[PDB]
């Protein structure tokens, strides 16, 4: 048989950096 | 006898990577 | 006599490859 | 699959500096 289907899109990325003072 | 059909489509694939920050 | 008839379609091909992240 | 979502917004930044005398 052909390939199969795509897998699940991924985990999301992580919490982004603090902000300015 | 012709060869058999194909076989079944293969397994989807993996999760994907991690998103952006 | 002649030949027998074909013989039975073969059996189904193996699952396919994964798929894609 | 694809990546994942971006990750959440990050954290507040620090308290600001001490105001003028």
């Known amino acids: ?3 199969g289907p795509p897998g ?3 985990p ?3 919490p982004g ?3 300015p003072p």
């Open 1 to 3: 048989g052909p390939p």
């Open 8 to 10: 699940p899109p991924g």
């Open 12 to 14: 999301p990325g992580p």
């Open 17 to 19: 950096p603090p902000g």
